[PDB]
Amino acid sequence: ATTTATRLTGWGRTAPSVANVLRTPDAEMIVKAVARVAESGGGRGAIARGLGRSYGDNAQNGGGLVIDMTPLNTIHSIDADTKLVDIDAGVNLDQLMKAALPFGLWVPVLPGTRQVTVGGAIACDIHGKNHHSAGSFGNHVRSMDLLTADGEIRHLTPTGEDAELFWATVGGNGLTGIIMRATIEMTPTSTAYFIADGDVTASLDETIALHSDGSEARYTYSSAWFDAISAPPKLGRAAVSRGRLATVEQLPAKLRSEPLKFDAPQLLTLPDVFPNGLANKYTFGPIGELWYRKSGTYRGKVQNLTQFYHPLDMFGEWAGFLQYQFVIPTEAVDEFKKIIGVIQASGHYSFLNVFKLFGPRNQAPLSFPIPGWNICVDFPIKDGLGKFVSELDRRVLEFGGRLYTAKDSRTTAETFHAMYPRVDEWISVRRKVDPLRVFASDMARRLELL
């Protein structure tokens, strides 16, 4: 148990603040720190911190306490018959994935990096490539133990007597208390592999058409990279990757011996093999166009996790960036296209772009995902950006969509509240379970959730 004044930022490395960071594997010691903050009521409160993968300010508390949860990382049990895992909130999804595979169990929702805690996964109600078929992380929690402001540990379930507080904690960014422990229902699987279909579109219109032609219902997993820099018609052209978990008999004979094995992250990546880039005299001409179309079009390709899910891993080596993520309701297709147009003409160039059609939402009043067009872009920080993303906020807002707290460090409270029309409902729950504001964060203060 060590308390240390530490300078903390999100993954985006901005808006730093200084907090007292408690790092203890001792659960009783955590209960006491919270009991202390509640006693000298009130101060600048406390907030949990997972692995720090949120880009913004949700896991920090300037001039307050921050409880690092990563030492509470015991997997208590895994059961293949019930498909249930019982794990501390500090367990991470990579650790969990590894521990569970031998049981034929699969982490039901995986984000774009496995370095996130169970606590972070719940508090941000994270989504992945399978949202349209599996919903978000919150949908899969069968119980969790929440340390509240009064110093008690409350056992919450999605349909029990504490359902309301359960669903306020899902997506609650740690502002209902500290998730100590949870039970997750896993997805059964017979292999660690995917059967994947790849498609390449020529334009924004094609990308939308492919996601609206009914084909999505044939794949449990689906996401795309899209072009956000090229002028129309090239704007919004996409490499789409869709699939489902493979069964044993679908594997080639070579891989049937160990169907649930995970492959090691290799020493040599593509920057190590080709140091001078991948560009040749063909890349930007018709043969290049033809080559990209071909490599990105395929059917029934067997892929492991890295290949199917982390296709940025092969580009290795390739701070001053602003991550922006929003979703626009399904029906607002024209408005969605408009927003992509605004991005392209902005003079702000993003290369790392995610496109995904979200499925049905859950009952959490602060849950980010709603059915519709989800987009992430990554803008280099340069003159004009701050004021331009505010304009984007305005358009996202008026088009019925919202920003994601896990990605935000700079939107206003007014915008956020308008984007989340159930925020008042949520605030009423939070105020009932934390009258003295024992739990607090830089985000809570910025977005007036405190």
Ligand X SMILES: C[C@H](CO)OC[C@@H](C)OC[C@@H](C)O
Q: Which of 8, 9, 11, 101 binds ligand FAD (CB under 6 A)?
A: 11
Residue 389, number of CB atoms within 10 A of its CB = 21
Listed ranges 79-87, 201-209, 237-245, 415-423: which one lies at the site for ligand X (CB under 6 A): 237-245
Binding mask of the shown chain, residues 120 to 139, with x at each position contacting ligand FAD by CB under 6 A: x--xx-xxx-----------
Rounded alpha-carbon distances, angstroms, from residue 93 to 121, 137, 223: 9, 11, 20
Query: Among the candidate windows 51-59, 158-166, 298-306, 392-400, which touches ligand FAD by CB under 6 A?
Result: 51-59
Quick check: 112 binds ligand RG2 (CB under 6 A)? yes
Number of residues near ligand FAD (by CB under 6 A): 30
What is the Cα 39 distance to its own chain's centre?
35
Helix axes 333-344, 385-398, angle to 10 degrees: 170
**What do you get for the CA distance between the two ends of the chain, in Å?**
28
How far is it, in rounded angstroms, from Cα 209 to Cα 213? 6
Cα 447 to Cα 441: distance, rounded to the nearest angstrom? 10
Residues 379-418 that bind ligand FAD (CB under 6 A): 406
d(CA 364, CA 165): 10
- Does the protein bind ligand FAD through residue 113 (CB under 6 A)? yes
239 binds, among ligand FAD, ligand X, ligand RG2, none (CB under 5 to 8 A by kind): ligand X
Mask for 214-233, x = binds ligand RG2 (CB under 6 A): ---------x-x--------
| Residue 293 C-beta: closest distance to ligand RG2, Å | 17
Task: Mark 32-61 as b/e (b = at least 16 C-beta within 10 Å).
Answer: bbbeebbeeeebbbbbbbbbbbbbbbbbbb
Q: Which of 283, 376, 273 is nearest to 316 (CA)?
A: 273
User: Is there binding between residue 54 and ligand X (CB under 6 A)?
Assistant: no
Q: Which of 83, 114, 129, 446 binds ligand RG2 (CB under 6 A)?
A: 129
CB within 8 Å of 82: residues ≥ 6 apart: none
CB neighbour burial string for 227-242, b if at least 16 within 10 angstroms, e if fewer:
bbeeeeeebbbbbbbb
From 85, 116, 184, 396, residue interacting with ligand FAD (rule: CB under 6 A) = 116
CB of 112 to ligand RG2, least distance (A): 3
Task: Report the 3 state secondary structure along 374-435.
Answer: EEEEEEECCCCHHHHHHHHHHHHHHCCCEECCCCCCCCCHHHHHHHCCCHHHHHHHHHHHCC
Residue 311 is a binding residue for ligand FAD (CB under 6 A): no
**Chosen residue from 58, 139, 223, 405 binding ligand X by CB under 6 A:** 223
Question: In what side-by-side order are the strands of the sheet with 178-185?
Answer: 75-79, 84-88, 178-185, 141-147, 153-156
The correct pick among 117, 201, 344, 411 for binding ligand FAD (CB under 6 A) is: 117
CB 131 within 8 A of CB 110: no
Which of 87, 109, 182, 224 binds ligand X (CB under 6 A)? It is 224
Beta bridge pairs of residue 232: none
* Choices 110-118, 186-194, 248-256, 283-291 (CB under 6 A): range interacting with ligand FAD: 110-118
Binding site per annotation, positions: 48-58, 112, 117-120, 124-127, 179, 404
Q: Does 375 sit near ligand FAD (CB under 6 A)?
A: no
Per CB under 6 A, 354 contacts ligand RG2 = yes
Which ranges of 76-158 does DSSP label H, i.e. alpha helix? 93-100, 118-123, 131-134
Q: How far is the CB of 276 from ligand FAD (least distance, A)?
A: 26
Q: Which stretch binds ligand FAD (CB under 6 A): 109-117, 158-166, 245-253, 254-262?
A: 109-117
Whole-angstrom Cα distance, residue 30 to residue 209?
51
* Length of the chain (residues): 450
Lookup: tokens for 295? 């490599």
34 neighbors 147 (Cβ within 8 angstroms):
yes
Asked if 225 is part of the footprint of ligand X (rule: CB under 6 A), the reply reads yes
Annotated binding site for FAD: 48-58, 112, 117-120, 124-127, 179, 404
Binding mask 277-316 for ligand X (x = CB under 6 A): ----------------------------------xx----
In this complex, which beta carbon is closest to ligand FAD, that of residue 209 or of residue 312?
312
Residues that bind ligand X (CB under 6 A): 112, 223-225, 239-241, 311-312, 354
Q: Which residues bind ligand RG2 (CB under 6 A)?
A: 112, 127-129, 223, 225, 311-312, 323, 352-354, 356, 374, 376
Residues of the shown chain interacting with ligand FAD in the complex, contacts defined by CB under 6 A: 11, 47-54, 58-59, 69, 89, 111-113, 116-117, 119-120, 123-124, 126-128, 173-174, 178-179, 406
